[PDB]
Symmetry: D3
């Protein structure tokens, strides 16, 4: 809606350095969808180990980035449960298509499928220059 | 029937700190299986951010650890392709049951399902346990050789 | 009884990258403590000790033992509402075998003497890896 | 000639956590260079500048531009087979806007004189100037 | 008349790994400040600048002086209850000698002009290693924010 | 000038970041003694953890700092044994007198006692004041 910067992401997510993988939330509509973006700089602690010969953002950290963007969605959609500590329950149908490299802007959109009580299921996609880098059919989450 | 120590691991996998998650390979049968373990300590760089109120090993790092073990199996199963930089192509059927906490040993088995010299296309299943109970299942991991 | 990592941080002030007790698996107040440290290649100190070969620094096997000793002192007698304990002295440290990534360091400390509200405690300590003695400490002295 | 990071580390000696150029998009030898720095929350410095509010250190934006300058000098003339370039002096540094996480800092350095070399530099975030550096002086050593 | 690291943390918001003042050995309000930064090989920036040879970044030397300047400003006049000082501009920076591991970066910053009205302060800065000048800075402009 | 700078220390000791704790050797007499200094800054990875509430250099890191200085000594005393990885075999008579804080210069001296298993003694000063005593360090 209005844009929501980092200082306010740290108020929603319990995550911190080196494991906060969302820089900005550019569009969020509660109970439907969220769009955020992660900047990929060589100046991140994980590159030095993946890999020294060739820096490629771990596929698992692109899941984690989406999974955190998905989290921001759930915790703004309903905060009657005042517990920001969400855990990944299950993930299904992850497909990585293109490497994500330093200097790239990872643009990510996750979409809610169902909510209950928590037990929430979301879909996720990430793009670098309008090309699909990673698909996630279903991310499940629990309190 | 040898245990493989860390220095030899670092000769197989191109992974370094802070993203190498195999501490030891304790069992490995080429073209078939692999069993190793990751030691979970409070003194790993990720636990400060996940989370400061409660320390829990990020389930994706478990995926990575299993993937890295799977990775080991592939490269000691067939290294005509002298390229160690493997990339995750897809993961499927991931269920996390139990939290992995500091002090735990994460024992991991991954099983090769299919391998094709075609492109470096290998499919693998995997389980992660802490104290004989299942903490993670992975139905299918797909990897591509560069 | 059984002290998990979250409860460890409530007792000790130690934080990353210098908190070297992952679990306390047996404790008896004013007598003994058994805890454990998981040695993984994913610790910041391994990159610098050493690149060619990874061996857990001997001084960190002391500190770990010293932190587990501290825990015992603080649970044994907490009339002194001060958690910041300082190393006073250490005596008769012998390293026998290397501690490597993949290893579980089993540690036990035994309280020898405590002088109440003077903060002067003395303890012994032994660390194990697969039933094998990897570090011995004759005497750790602490100041509250 | 566009340059990715792997090749950047072949030109610059800078490494983690003090390599502040992620890509080189345009490079004209002896004339101009344009590159970008991705400002993400997952950088080591942000934890300390500041806890309460995250703002890229102005000194690092200079540094980012400085290395951008450094590459340009090296790919202009490398009969000096010495990649170690030192900051000899900086002038006319003006910070207009803070740089925050999630920003793309775009950078253009211009060579002025090479004998010892002199360069100007500008940094953009969404077409808007966030930093001006009139003169960066460098000494090969 | 010397303020140690715990107190520096009460004045400055800067934290690890971007706090670059270890001690303030002399400070006179509205006029001058003298402090020192200890250069150790066990600093996280050394690994990247550079692997082949360890040299404390010219830019960080700026930061350290600026930070020392920062302290001076905050203890000169604290009616503006705001410790987040931002660098507005820096002028006439000349680096003379490399600062190496093992060196004690002794620093002096001197206030020139302050307009309480706005939140704008101007300071010169000098750094010495063994009484030898390593860094000159003619002007460091700051904005209270 | 009897000194050793960091770039030369790194050729003698294998140790690297974040566990190299000797910034400079200032004096060295083979088979007798060695003087070195470690700079203690707030910009060191360990201070964030020990402690957050009050920054004090771990007693153990003062041992290691003196140990590494003692390690440089044995290696330059006699490098017929072409092996730089020295292991601390034991340590005895460690007493810590004063807290070492950020801002301090840790001035260390180690002295060779016996070489066959090498034994050495160690002292650390902070502004002439004695902060650490090590009766005996054993090396293998
Ligand atoms: O998970 C990994 C790293 C591995 O190869 C392994 F084996 F460690 F899992 C990864 C997967 C996909 C990409 N990608 O395409 O961006 C990058 C890295
Ligand atoms: O403190 C060290 C590191 C060193 O080698 C040196 F040189 F730094 F002292 C150490 C001490 C004891 C063992 N051990 O248990 O065998 C291994 C390493
Ligand atoms: Cl302690
Ligand atoms: Cl530079
Ligand atoms: Cl500042």
């Amino acid at each position: 809606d209005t844009s929501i910067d980092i200082e306010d992401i740290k108020k929603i997510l319990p995550h911190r350095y080196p494991f906060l993988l969302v820089d900005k939330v550019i569009y969020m509509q509660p109970n439907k969808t969220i769009i955020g973006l992660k900047q990929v700089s060589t100046n991140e602690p994980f590159f030095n180990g993946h890999f020294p010969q060739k820096q490629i953002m771990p596929g698992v950290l692109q899941i984690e980035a989406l999974a955190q963007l998905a989290g921001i969605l759930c915790l703004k959609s309903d905060d009657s449960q005042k517990n920001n500590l969400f855990l990944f329950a299950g993930v299904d149908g992850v497909r990585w298509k293109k490497p994500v490299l330093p200097g790239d802007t990872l643009t990510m959109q996750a979409n809610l499928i169902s909510f209950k009580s928590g037990i929430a299921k979301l879909s996720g996609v990430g793009y670098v220059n309008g090309k699909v880098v990673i698909n996630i059919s279903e991310m499940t989450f629990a309190l």
